């Protein structure tokens, strides 16, 4: 089967450099132009760069021209993206994609890799603070945990060591003006269960080795 | 650059219905247009290319047409796996994409249940106060959430987050978080969240008095 797999994404300070890679299998790599396409968090798709099958020509989106360089090593079936002068607005999932051609048509993207996430930020690693959202709508009550001020993504939240998933909503993180992330996880429960059952949010933030269990009581 | 605009920005339909998606280019792109599908957390997938040709593996219910600046993707008899985001893409002048049309599952209108959470004492000890308003299990996604502090409308100090459409009941949930300094928080008494939604005969207000 055809397959593309990217690697090299991560957190990078603005001004620093980063190299991405894409290894191909399942098709004749040296017959195809190859592309980089990116997607900012929650946004649409933006083409980044194209390189000829033989590496003879390279073209770039207006937003990255002069700052990113595309290359390839056909002997390794690998595509590269050299990212220099990185800016916060370059934060995105970066996909590699093959130039799909058939009959007289070309310049479409198929297949795609799974993507690699590049986070450009001057922020430093920070473990979250975990605060209770304490239950205070008829028979149903709501409670949760506020996971505030961490960097970088991701954090994972479970309830009662994973035994409780019914009624749980863990919201996507938001980026604050400080550069730190924040999210909340909530659960709706019977109001009659507040003093009789136990609800513990389990918060894991690997970059800071943060592991917090917080019992949430009224 | 050639700008691609997609309409409608959102489309809400039931399984088995027909979906019609439009892409308009700012200048002619001949028939050099493709359509892509993307599900949450996944890479895009090529569906249609050269405006009207189905890629390998694209089901027959997907069909495309168009030329010059106006293009149409039609999904007949929607299946549950078809509810996703769809992008158009031109290759006449370099490569640009439309911003995407999000197709979600139309269910009966459901009013949100509304809850408000004061900041914990532990957070106040750190110098910051986060006030959280929760809208749980509502449909459609459109809703207005306003913060009022001693009846003053808050602007620029809150952020919203919304879940994806629930796989089990097709609803959404939404949080709005008002962030103040500890000093600002303790300057006022009444903290209120006002929720306007099509499923509510009148907007709902949830509120508390600080320190009570």
């Amino acid at each position: 089967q055809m397959h593309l797999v990217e690697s090299g994404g991560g957190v990078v300070q603005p001004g620093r450099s980063l190299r991405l890679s894409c290894v191909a299998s399942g098709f004749t790599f040296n017959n195809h132009g190859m592309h980089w396409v990116r997607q900012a968090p929650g946004k649409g798709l933006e083409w980044v760069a194209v390189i000829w099958h033989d590496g003879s020509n390279k073209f770039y989106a207006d937003s990255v021209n002069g700052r990113f360089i595309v290359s390839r090593d056909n002997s390794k079936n690998t595509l590269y993206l050299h990212m220099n002068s990185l800016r916060a607005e370059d934060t995105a999932v970066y996909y590699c994609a093959r130039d799909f051609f058939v009959s007289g048509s070309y310049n479409y993207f198929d297949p795609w890799g799974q993507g690699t996430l590049v986070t450009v930020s001057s922020a430093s690693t920070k473990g979250p603070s975990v605060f209770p959202l304490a239950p205070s709508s008829g028979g149903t009550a709501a409670l949760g945990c506020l996971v505030k001020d961490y960097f970088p993504e991701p954090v994972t939240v479970s309830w009662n060591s994973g035994a409780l998933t019914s009624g749980v909503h863990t919201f996507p993180a938001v980026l604050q003006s400080s550069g730190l992330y924040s999210l909340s996880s909530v659960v709706t429960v019977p109001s009659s269960s507040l003093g009789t059952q136990t609800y513990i949010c389990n918060v894991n933030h690997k970059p800071s080795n943060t592991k917090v269990d917080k019992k949430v009581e009224p | 650059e050639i700008v691609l605009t997609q309409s409608p920005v959102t489309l809400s339909l039931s399984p088995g219905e027909r979906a019609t998606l439009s892409c308009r280019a700012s200048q002619s792109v001949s028939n050099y247009l493709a359509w892509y599908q993307q599900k949450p957390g996944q890479a895009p997938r090529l569906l249609i290319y050269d405006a009207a040709n189905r890629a390998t593996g694209t089901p027959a219910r997907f069909s495309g047409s168009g030329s010059g600046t106006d293009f149409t993707l039609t999904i007949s008899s929607l299946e549950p796996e078809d509810f996703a985001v769809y992008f158009c893409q031109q290759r006449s002048k370099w490569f640009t994409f439309g911003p995407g049309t999000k197709l979600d599952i139309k269910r009966t209108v459901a009013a949100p249940s509304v809850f408000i959470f004061p900041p914990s004492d532990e957070q106040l000890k750190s110098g910051t106060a986060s006030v959280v308003c929760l809208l749980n299990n509502f449909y459609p996604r459109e809703a207005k959430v306003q913060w009022k502090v001693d009846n003053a409308l808050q602007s620029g100090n809150s952020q919203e987050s919304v879940t994806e459409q629930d796989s089990k009941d097709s609803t959404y949930s939404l949080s709005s978080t008002l962030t103040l300094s500890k000093a600002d928080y303790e300057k006022h008494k009444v903290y209120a969240c006002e929720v306007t939604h099509q499923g509510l005969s009148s907007p709902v207000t949830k509120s508390f008095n600080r320190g009570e």
Binding site: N31, G33, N57 | -
Partner: peptide, 9 residues
Amino acid sequence: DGNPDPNAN
């Protein structure tokens, strides 16, 4: 019209 073909011929 379009863009130059980047693939092998």
